[PDB]
Coordinates of C-alpha atoms in Angstrom, one line a residue:
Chain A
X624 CA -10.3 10.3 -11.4
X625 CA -13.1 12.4 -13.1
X626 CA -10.3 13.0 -15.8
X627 CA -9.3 9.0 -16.0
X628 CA -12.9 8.4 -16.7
X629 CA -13.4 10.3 -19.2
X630 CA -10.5 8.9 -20.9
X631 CA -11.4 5.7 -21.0
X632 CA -14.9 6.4 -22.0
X633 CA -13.5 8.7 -24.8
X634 CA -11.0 5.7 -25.8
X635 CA -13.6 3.4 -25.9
X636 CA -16.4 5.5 -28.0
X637 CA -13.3 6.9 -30.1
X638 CA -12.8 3.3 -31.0
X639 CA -16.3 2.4 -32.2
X640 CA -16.1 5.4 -34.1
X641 CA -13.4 4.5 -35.4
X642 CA -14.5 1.2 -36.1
X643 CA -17.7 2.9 -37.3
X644 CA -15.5 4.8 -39.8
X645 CA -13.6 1.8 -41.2
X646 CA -16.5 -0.1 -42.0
X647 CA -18.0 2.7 -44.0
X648 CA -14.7 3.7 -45.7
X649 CA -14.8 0.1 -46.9
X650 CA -18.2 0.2 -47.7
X651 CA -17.4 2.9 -50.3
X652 CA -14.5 0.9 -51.2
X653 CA -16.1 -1.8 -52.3
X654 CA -18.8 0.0 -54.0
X655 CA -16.0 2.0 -56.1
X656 CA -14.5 -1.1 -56.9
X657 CA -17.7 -2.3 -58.4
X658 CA -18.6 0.8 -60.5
X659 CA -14.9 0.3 -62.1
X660 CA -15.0 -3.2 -63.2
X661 CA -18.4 -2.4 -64.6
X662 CA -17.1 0.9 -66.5
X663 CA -14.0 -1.1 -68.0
X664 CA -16.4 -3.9 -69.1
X665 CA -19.2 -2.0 -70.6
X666 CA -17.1 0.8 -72.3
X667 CA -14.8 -1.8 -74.3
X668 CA -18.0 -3.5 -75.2
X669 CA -19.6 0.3 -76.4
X670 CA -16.3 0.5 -78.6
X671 CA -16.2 -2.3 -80.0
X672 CA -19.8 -2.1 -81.3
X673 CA -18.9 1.7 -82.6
X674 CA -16.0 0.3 -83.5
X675 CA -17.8 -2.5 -85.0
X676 CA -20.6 -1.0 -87.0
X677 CA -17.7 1.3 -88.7
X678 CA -15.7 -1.3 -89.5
X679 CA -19.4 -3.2 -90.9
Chain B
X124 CA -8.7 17.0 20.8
X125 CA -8.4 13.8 22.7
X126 CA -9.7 10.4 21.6
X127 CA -12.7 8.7 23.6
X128 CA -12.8 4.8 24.3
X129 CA -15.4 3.3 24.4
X130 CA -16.9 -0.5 22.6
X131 CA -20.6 1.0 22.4
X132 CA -20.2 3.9 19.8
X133 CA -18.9 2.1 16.8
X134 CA -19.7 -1.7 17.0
X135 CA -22.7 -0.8 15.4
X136 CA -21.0 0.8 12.6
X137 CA -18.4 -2.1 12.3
X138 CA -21.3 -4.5 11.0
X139 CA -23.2 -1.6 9.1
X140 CA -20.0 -0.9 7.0
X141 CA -19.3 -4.4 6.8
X142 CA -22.8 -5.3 5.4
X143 CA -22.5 -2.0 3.1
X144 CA -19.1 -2.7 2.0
X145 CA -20.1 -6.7 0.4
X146 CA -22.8 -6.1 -0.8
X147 CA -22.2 -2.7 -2.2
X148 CA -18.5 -4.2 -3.9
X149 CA -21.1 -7.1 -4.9
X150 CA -23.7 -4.8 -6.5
X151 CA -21.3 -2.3 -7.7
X152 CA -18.7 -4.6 -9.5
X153 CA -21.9 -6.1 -11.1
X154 CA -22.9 -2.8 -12.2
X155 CA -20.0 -1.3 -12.9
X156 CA -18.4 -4.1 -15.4
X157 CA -21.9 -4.6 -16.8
X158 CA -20.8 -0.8 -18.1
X159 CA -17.6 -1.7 -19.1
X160 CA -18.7 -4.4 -20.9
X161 CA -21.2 -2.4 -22.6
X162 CA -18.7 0.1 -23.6
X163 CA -16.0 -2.2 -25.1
X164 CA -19.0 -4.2 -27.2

């Protein structure tokens, strides 16, 4: 019984961990998406305007 | 080694266990799920 009791109480904290775990993994997810789309637009906008001022 | 008869010995222990038994299922459910509850939130 001792045994089955710590099972479930293991099952159950395993599972906010877990839970815990997710929601941080997305957390960076989202934050790596963000730094991406910025990096895309500001570098094509950086060569354009080197690209720019040597075409000028 | 054999068993003793008697109604004075263990009617007093019929209603104690009773009273124990209800109210302790009552109190300890309550308790107990309270936990369980605590743990699956």
């Amino acid at each position: 019984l001792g045994d089955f009791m710590d099972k479930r109480d293991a099952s159950i904290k395993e599972q906010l961990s877990g839970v815990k775990d997710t929601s941080s993994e997305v957390k960076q997810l989202e934050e790596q998406a963000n730094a991406v789309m910025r990096a895309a637009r500001a570098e094509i906008s950086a060569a354009l305007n080197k690209m720019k001022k040597e075409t000028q | 080694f054999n068993t003793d008869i008697l109604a004075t010995n263990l009617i007093n222990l019929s209603v104690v266990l009773g009273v124990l038994i209800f109210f302790g299922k009552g109190v300890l459910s309550d308790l107990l799920d309270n936990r369980k509850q605590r743990i699956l939130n």
